[PDB]
Amino acid sequence: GSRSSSSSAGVLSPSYANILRARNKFADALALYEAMLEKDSKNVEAHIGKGICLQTQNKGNLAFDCFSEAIRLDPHNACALTHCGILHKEEGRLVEAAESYQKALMADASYKPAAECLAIVLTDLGTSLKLAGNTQEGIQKYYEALKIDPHYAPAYYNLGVVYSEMMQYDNALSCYEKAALERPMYAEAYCNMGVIYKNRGDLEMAITCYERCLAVSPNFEIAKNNMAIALTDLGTKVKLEGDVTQGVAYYKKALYYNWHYADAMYNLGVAYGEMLKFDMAIVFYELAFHFNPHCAEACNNLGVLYKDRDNLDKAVECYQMALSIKPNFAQSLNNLGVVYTVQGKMDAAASMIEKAILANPTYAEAFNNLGVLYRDAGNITMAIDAYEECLKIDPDSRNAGQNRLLAMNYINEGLDDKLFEAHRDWGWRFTRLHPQYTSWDNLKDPERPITIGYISPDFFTHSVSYFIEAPLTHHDYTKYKVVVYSAVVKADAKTYRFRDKVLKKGGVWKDIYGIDEKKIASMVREDKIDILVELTGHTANNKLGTMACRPAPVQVTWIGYPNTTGLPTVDYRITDSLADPPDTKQKQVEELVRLPDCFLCYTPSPEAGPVSPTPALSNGFVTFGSFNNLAKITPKVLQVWARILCAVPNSRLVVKCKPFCCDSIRQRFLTTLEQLGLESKRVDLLPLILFNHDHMQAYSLMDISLDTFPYAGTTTTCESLYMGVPCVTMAGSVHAHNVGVSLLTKVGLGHLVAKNEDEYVQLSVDLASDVTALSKLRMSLRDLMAGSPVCNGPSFAVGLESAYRNMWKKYCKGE
Amino acid sequence: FSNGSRSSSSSAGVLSPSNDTLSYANILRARNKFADALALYEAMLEKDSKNVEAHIGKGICLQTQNKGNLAFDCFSEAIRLDPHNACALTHCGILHKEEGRLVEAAESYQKALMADASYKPAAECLAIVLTDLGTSLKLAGNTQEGIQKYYEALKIDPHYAPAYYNLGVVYSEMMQYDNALSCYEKAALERPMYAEAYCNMGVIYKNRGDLEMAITCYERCLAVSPNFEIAKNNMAIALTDLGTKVKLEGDVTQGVAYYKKALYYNWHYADAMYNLGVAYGEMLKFDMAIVFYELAFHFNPHCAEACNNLGVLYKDRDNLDKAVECYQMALSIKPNFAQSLNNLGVVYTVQGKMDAAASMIEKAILANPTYAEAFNNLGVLYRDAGNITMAIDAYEECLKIDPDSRNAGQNRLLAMNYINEGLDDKLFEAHRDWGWRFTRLHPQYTSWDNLKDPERPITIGYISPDFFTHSVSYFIEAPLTHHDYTKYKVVVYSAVVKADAKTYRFRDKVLKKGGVWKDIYGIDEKKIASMVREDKIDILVELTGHTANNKLGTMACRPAPVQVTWIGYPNTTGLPTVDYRITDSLADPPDTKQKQVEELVRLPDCFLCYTPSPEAGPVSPTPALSNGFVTFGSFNNLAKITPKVLQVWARILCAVPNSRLVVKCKPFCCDSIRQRFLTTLEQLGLESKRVDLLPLILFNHDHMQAYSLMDISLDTFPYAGTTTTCESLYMGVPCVTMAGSVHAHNVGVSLLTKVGLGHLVAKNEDEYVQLSVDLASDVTALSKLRMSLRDLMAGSPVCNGPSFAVGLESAYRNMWKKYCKG
Ligand SMILES: Nc1nc2c(ncn2[C@@H]2O[C@H](COP(=O)(O)OP(=O)(O)O)[C@@H](O)[C@H]2O)c(=O)[nH]1
């Protein structure tokens, strides 16, 4: 059997001090209680009143005495029972406290003070359980507290931290949401909600949870840092979707919450650099690296920005600090190698780039820079290899693609068509990557004044300048106007001297540096360009992408590159009947326009200096020499030069090249000559010198210059003939081989043109034979060809401008 | 004839004489092929032991192989066989210099030049060694002897730059900066890549005031050496100084540009960072300015100005805990810093720590005895604490320092209404003197292009910052909801600094009725004035008086031809540009002796219209039935509770026994001012157990409901409550007011009379006290009153806007009447 009970009702409950108490009149109300107890020692309300007063005074031992006196007079008093529990909790008797709360609620279930106090102590019992690992027994103790008081927020919040610790993030959320509903001023709940929303991949909602958290506590540092982190991550997310400025805005806000968050510094350096604001980007990077000494990315990007400023010393130091943090950081190894390539430290540059490639085996630009390095040291086969390996990785790489076509000219003697096919194959693949204009508004009238355009990056002191100063000066702007599209990366006195000249005669000058080739293409239509002539070919910083769109009705290539462009968009190429004879078996994608006499016209800088005495008179021997690229001096050229120097007794050879500062290049260049018979004390490998005056006064040490093949010199022979030193050249089957033919011949020294090796050799030693004839030839040369058609501008412009107007006349009909 | 040496006649020597191995060896030597050349030289010497050029070539080759004393042994045979070979003598002098025998080097250099005066190598090396001797003598203090050694090298080689540079160095430390400049200019002309000369030139130009010249000198220096660190730091210092100079000429933008470029040269130059925070704060870009200040204080922990300006920016964010932290570190670095002392005291004032606030502000006044705004903040402290006479004393102290201080002058006039009874005319004179001063500083518009038709459609401008949950809002809601907008189109100029739900609600209603709402927060009052003229405003009505964020400066320009003041301030404005003032026949009787600057426009019924809170709550029963005692009290400003009010209330609390007082004010959050009020009241005969000082309850609904605690409210005098008595009436709590001489003393008269309860309008103290104890006797009658007051006042003219509206717009066109007539 089971026990059951019927309940009887008791006697009907009978029909200043505490009002002062509610208004915090502790001392006055206390006195009335003390008086009340001496008038009647069994009034429980007086005992409870004094106990609350004494509890304010921190006299807890006395309060437990009188609260117990109240329960012993009148048990089932919710107030007295609840207060004895409050004392039991503050003393540390938590379970005895909850017992007193429970018998209070039995007395009066409506007495919410006991419900709230009980929920608090049960929550504390549950969180003590959680730390002891009894999590499930703790979770239950939480839910009991919520049954007693469903509005106690700490129970919801403590439920959320285990539901997150047990990785039930949805459950942890709903606990935190109701914690925030029962207490809108719960920062910790809002902050922990933001952390979950962040880790789950919605930072916008994480950020609005952090916003609500810091609205309650602006100095909640943990949430402050998490706010910066979330704001930086969302800045990066918005930046990659194309909105750079809003990403920058988020980055700066992230710094408001955390002014030393390095990740926002670095990302602001990246975004400002992309905005071309490099001066400020440098500051952000230094600040990032200051706060984060492990941010090797900031050191790298600083090195890049300082290399674009030509501060190579500081660029090295930045790369060094990057590589001291991440030794296998592929960018900094490559970037350091690029700097060393420029400084001439060839061995170190190769080591740097080789390590960059080991780090990133598909670092295509690293392979292209390696080919650049090999070509600079005059190793064309290996340079082409490094370009071909880059092209295996990126078949559309603009850099290696053009650098490979250019490199192949240094060794192509043109007995097949593989060179022309390589150019043509490149032109097809390149033109498909470029939208082409299929109609042109230009008014078709043959004898209209023509505005012709020259696009080139070489309007500074550069090889092309000496041959593009003659037209700019002696062009007739009245009926052949010129519009110069200058892509000069670093201008100099020559650029402004050109510019001010061009502007004075009535032509246009547009700086196109940093401008995409597609906008340049549409500028060409704005300027109504009739003749668009590019002067770079596949040499560095060319603008062939502009040509690939065909902005002008007619396009020509000239001066810059000794071959075809391979572009079907170009129609013409300006040569002469000697550099490209009419029987040339070399294929070229453009139609060849052969100008009267020479296709070039040299203009010498008047600060060259006078023709200096022939050294053979003061030295007792004849010195041969060349000032061409190391890349042009093939091993078959050293063979021929060694025959020449084995023919002339005690003669000497001198060559000046940039890589000759590095002695690994100089020593190996010597070794190849000593196994070739020529010993070291007869050969002088001079390093590059920086002054132009000193350069053309460095022909003082040379009696005869020897041209290169299959890539013959163009400016170097023109400069040599200007300083009195004659040049024996060799003809060939391709254009790059016969430039020396046309130059020497139209100057008047065609008898110094050789058709083969043996003639080349015999001509050179024949010329070293009579030293007095040398001395007279030296003085005759400068004025011989200053009055030739090689140095006379106005003569050239007529035939060129007549070619331009025939160009125009063909187009007009529809050729 | 005892005499000195005679003149010497010189004869010429034997004629100079009229190759291949010597030429080969010399070219090998010229191209650094030294070991090969040495072989050929040695062969020349065994063929001819006296070949002097082979001796010289051998010595040069051997010297490059670090065999020095053997090279000396070749050069010495060279000088023995040929004593007039300049080349040999110079190589001996070169060796002498390399071996530290600096005197024997100049010895052989001079000997070589005696041999050949045109031998340039001898001149060049001798110039080098002589300047080295000169700098050595300068290090040894023989300054003048060093200067002549420089000029000696300049005589032999006038193209040797280091002589010019070192001359400029000594000239600089001798403070001949013009001589130093010309020396460096020549040094740069002889050597254009002489960076140190450009750097030192910039230092002179900077120290002489010409920054713009200095930065170009540093530019030419760093174009040669981009990594010249002290030239970089000097460039940042100059750029920051020049950015500050041009920022004080008004061009803040490029002043910022100079600061940023300085950071490119020195990324941790704290001075540029702090100045960027100053400029970016002036541009209102407070978030970025915080980062600049934190970076400045990070790189310069001794920059207390960064901590000060940081605290100010976080205080305007209400992050007082962080503001305090900022101010305390600024005082960690500069304990005497007046701004941070004052600012920390401002924060303490807002928090309620009245005496820490007073001590701080006093320390600021010690640091700067003319700190006008510190005196003003002292008065604000005293006014908040309720000590009006000291608040006025603080304002008057500031006005001695700055007679045109706006905060002080307007706070002084407003504070005088709390205590002024109005027997004299000194209050009106103080207002009139302020208006004369204030109009002397605001240019007036003398022409008004507004069309002159008396019954034309006209626009009424309301300009107030109180269009938010503010006392004034409860009285301006009525004209906004009930206005014609047809011939009386209203235009609001809201200067609300922190909008809330009521502001959005007001902006909605005015736009739906057909008016315009223009937020003028932060816009200059003179720009506000011409904005009043753009919007064709015909009658400008200001609602703020001398209370906070008033726009009386706009009014002082007189942008509109007719100007009014209303609601906000219980007195005249003092401005002669304001033409009229809206009041009523009870608050301002026709027989009043209180003098104004504007013409009084008395209106029918009350001059105010109360639109009450929608969610106020219901009326609560009178608590006297539950308590057993009657409760008195007031929810008015502590400032309004003058000590004279306290004495009157004291004898009220003495007449009704076992009754209590309750007063709810913000300054009672500070327990010290709390019980200072109590001890004052105890000496007045009413001890602390019968008084209750309630801190402000920041929730509106709970504040309205707090009237449950009190049976009868007691108006203040001479400044009588305006919202509070309206509020208390709407909660059924009756309020007895006392009338007086001035308008602030008779607001409660107009309110109560026109609400329907003129029997609670006292006429003196004895009236006031006995009417209160009259209603403190019949508790049942009080139960009748509490549930009736609500519906009568809603029916009173005090709460019905449309009737109020036509009365207002009648007076409005009645002023547009006189404007056209002339
Ligand atoms: N939220 C809130 N507002 C209050 C409280 N006490 C007063 N106010 C507001 O402050 C205004 C009273 O300002 P006061 O200067 O005393 O008005 P006046 O003395 O009648 O001219 C009223 O409009 C109330 O809305 C409070 O305890 N809580």
PDB file of C-alpha atoms in Angstrom, chain A residues 347-438:
ATOM      1  CA  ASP A 347      76.484  34.079 -59.301  1.00  0.00           C
ATOM      2  CA  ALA A 348      74.497  35.242 -56.268  1.00  0.00           C
ATOM      3  CA  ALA A 349      71.573  36.182 -58.515  1.00  0.00           C
ATOM      4  CA  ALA A 350      71.454  32.665 -59.972  1.00  0.00           C
ATOM      5  CA  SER A 351      71.590  31.105 -56.502  1.00  0.00           C
ATOM      6  CA  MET A 352      68.730  33.330 -55.330  1.00  0.00           C
ATOM      7  CA  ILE A 353      66.471  32.495 -58.273  1.00  0.00           C
ATOM      8  CA  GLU A 354      67.323  28.789 -58.181  1.00  0.00           C
ATOM      9  CA  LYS A 355      66.181  28.718 -54.555  1.00  0.00           C
ATOM     10  CA  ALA A 356      63.038  30.635 -55.533  1.00  0.00           C
ATOM     11  CA  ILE A 357      62.279  27.908 -58.081  1.00  0.00           C
ATOM     12  CA  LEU A 358      62.987  25.111 -55.587  1.00  0.00           C
ATOM     13  CA  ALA A 359      60.498  26.767 -53.221  1.00  0.00           C
ATOM     14  CA  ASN A 360      57.819  27.253 -55.920  1.00  0.00           C
ATOM     15  CA  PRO A 361      58.434  24.736 -58.746  1.00  0.00           C
ATOM     16  CA  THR A 362      55.828  26.552 -60.909  1.00  0.00           C
ATOM     17  CA  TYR A 363      57.190  30.076 -60.287  1.00  0.00           C
ATOM     18  CA  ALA A 364      57.045  30.968 -63.967  1.00  0.00           C
ATOM     19  CA  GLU A 365      58.245  34.557 -63.556  1.00  0.00           C
ATOM     20  CA  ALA A 366      61.204  33.198 -61.582  1.00  0.00           C
ATOM     21  CA  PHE A 367      62.119  31.083 -64.613  1.00  0.00           C
ATOM     22  CA  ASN A 368      61.790  34.141 -66.861  1.00  0.00           C
ATOM     23  CA  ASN A 369      64.091  36.143 -64.592  1.00  0.00           C
ATOM     24  CA  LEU A 370      66.571  33.259 -64.701  1.00  0.00           C
ATOM     25  CA  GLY A 371      66.626  33.448 -68.496  1.00  0.00           C
ATOM     26  CA  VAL A 372      67.142  37.206 -68.266  1.00  0.00           C
ATOM     27  CA  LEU A 373      70.147  36.573 -66.022  1.00  0.00           C
ATOM     28  CA  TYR A 374      71.603  33.961 -68.391  1.00  0.00           C
ATOM     29  CA  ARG A 375      71.153  36.251 -71.394  1.00  0.00           C
ATOM     30  CA  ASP A 376      72.844  39.143 -69.571  1.00  0.00           C
ATOM     31  CA  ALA A 377      75.923  36.951 -69.036  1.00  0.00           C
ATOM     32  CA  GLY A 378      75.761  36.029 -72.724  1.00  0.00           C
ATOM     33  CA  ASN A 379      74.573  32.439 -72.410  1.00  0.00           C
ATOM     34  CA  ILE A 380      71.793  32.473 -74.977  1.00  0.00           C
ATOM     35  CA  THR A 381      71.078  28.739 -75.108  1.00  0.00           C
ATOM     36  CA  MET A 382      70.482  28.484 -71.363  1.00  0.00           C
ATOM     37  CA  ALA A 383      68.535  31.756 -71.417  1.00  0.00           C
ATOM     38  CA  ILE A 384      66.192  30.326 -74.068  1.00  0.00           C
ATOM     39  CA  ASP A 385      65.849  27.178 -71.944  1.00  0.00           C
ATOM     40  CA  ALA A 386      64.712  29.160 -68.897  1.00  0.00           C
ATOM     41  CA  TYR A 387      62.211  30.975 -71.121  1.00  0.00           C
ATOM     42  CA  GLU A 388      60.987  27.680 -72.565  1.00  0.00           C
ATOM     43  CA  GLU A 389      60.547  26.201 -69.089  1.00  0.00           C
ATOM     44  CA  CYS A 390      58.535  29.244 -68.006  1.00  0.00           C
ATOM     45  CA  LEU A 391      56.405  28.819 -71.131  1.00  0.00           C
ATOM     46  CA  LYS A 392      55.769  25.177 -70.237  1.00  0.00           C
ATOM     47  CA  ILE A 393      54.344  26.479 -66.946  1.00  0.00           C
ATOM     48  CA  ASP A 394      52.527  29.539 -68.377  1.00  0.00           C
ATOM     49  CA  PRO A 395      52.093  29.244 -72.166  1.00  0.00           C
ATOM     50  CA  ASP A 396      50.724  32.812 -72.322  1.00  0.00           C
ATOM     51  CA  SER A 397      53.502  34.494 -70.314  1.00  0.00           C
ATOM     52  CA  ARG A 398      54.096  37.840 -72.037  1.00  0.00           C
ATOM     53  CA  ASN A 399      57.567  38.123 -70.507  1.00  0.00           C
ATOM     54  CA  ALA A 400      59.225  34.824 -71.416  1.00  0.00           C
ATOM     55  CA  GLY A 401      57.406  34.722 -74.746  1.00  0.00           C
ATOM     56  CA  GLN A 402      58.867  37.984 -76.018  1.00  0.00           C
ATOM     57  CA  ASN A 403      62.219  37.452 -74.272  1.00  0.00           C
ATOM     58  CA  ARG A 404      62.544  34.126 -76.097  1.00  0.00           C
ATOM     59  CA  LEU A 405      61.845  35.543 -79.563  1.00  0.00           C
ATOM     60  CA  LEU A 406      64.328  38.331 -78.824  1.00  0.00           C
ATOM     61  CA  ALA A 407      66.964  35.915 -77.495  1.00  0.00           C
ATOM     62  CA  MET A 408      66.794  33.644 -80.542  1.00  0.00           C
ATOM     63  CA  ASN A 409      68.034  36.484 -82.777  1.00  0.00           C
ATOM     64  CA  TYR A 410      71.410  36.379 -81.000  1.00  0.00           C
ATOM     65  CA  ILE A 411      72.214  32.934 -82.465  1.00  0.00           C
ATOM     66  CA  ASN A 412      69.797  32.506 -85.394  1.00  0.00           C
ATOM     67  CA  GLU A 413      71.788  32.502 -88.624  1.00  0.00           C
ATOM     68  CA  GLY A 414      68.525  31.985 -90.524  1.00  0.00           C
ATOM     69  CA  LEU A 415      68.953  28.846 -92.645  1.00  0.00           C
ATOM     70  CA  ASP A 416      65.467  27.508 -91.768  1.00  0.00           C
ATOM     71  CA  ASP A 417      62.083  29.034 -90.963  1.00  0.00           C
ATOM     72  CA  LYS A 418      61.758  27.987 -87.303  1.00  0.00           C
ATOM     73  CA  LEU A 419      62.453  31.572 -86.191  1.00  0.00           C
ATOM     74  CA  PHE A 420      59.723  33.109 -88.362  1.00  0.00           C
ATOM     75  CA  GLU A 421      57.302  30.361 -87.328  1.00  0.00           C
ATOM     76  CA  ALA A 422      58.005  31.044 -83.649  1.00  0.00           C
ATOM     77  CA  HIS A 423      57.215  34.721 -84.225  1.00  0.00           C
ATOM     78  CA  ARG A 424      54.073  33.872 -86.203  1.00  0.00           C
ATOM     79  CA  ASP A 425      52.894  31.295 -83.653  1.00  0.00           C
ATOM     80  CA  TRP A 426      53.287  33.920 -80.927  1.00  0.00           C
ATOM     81  CA  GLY A 427      51.356  36.471 -82.980  1.00  0.00           C
ATOM     82  CA  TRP A 428      48.336  34.206 -83.419  1.00  0.00           C
ATOM     83  CA  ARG A 429      48.141  33.255 -79.740  1.00  0.00           C
ATOM     84  CA  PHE A 430      48.682  36.888 -78.712  1.00  0.00           C
ATOM     85  CA  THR A 431      46.118  38.427 -81.086  1.00  0.00           C
ATOM     86  CA  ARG A 432      43.401  36.073 -79.825  1.00  0.00           C
ATOM     87  CA  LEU A 433      43.888  37.420 -76.281  1.00  0.00           C
ATOM     88  CA  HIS A 434      43.171  40.959 -77.577  1.00  0.00           C
ATOM     89  CA  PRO A 435      39.933  42.417 -78.989  1.00  0.00           C
ATOM     90  CA  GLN A 436      40.552  44.051 -82.354  1.00  0.00           C
ATOM     91  CA  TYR A 437      38.819  47.097 -83.797  1.00  0.00           C
ATOM     92  CA  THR A 438      37.195  46.205 -87.119  1.00  0.00           C
TER      93      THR A 438
END
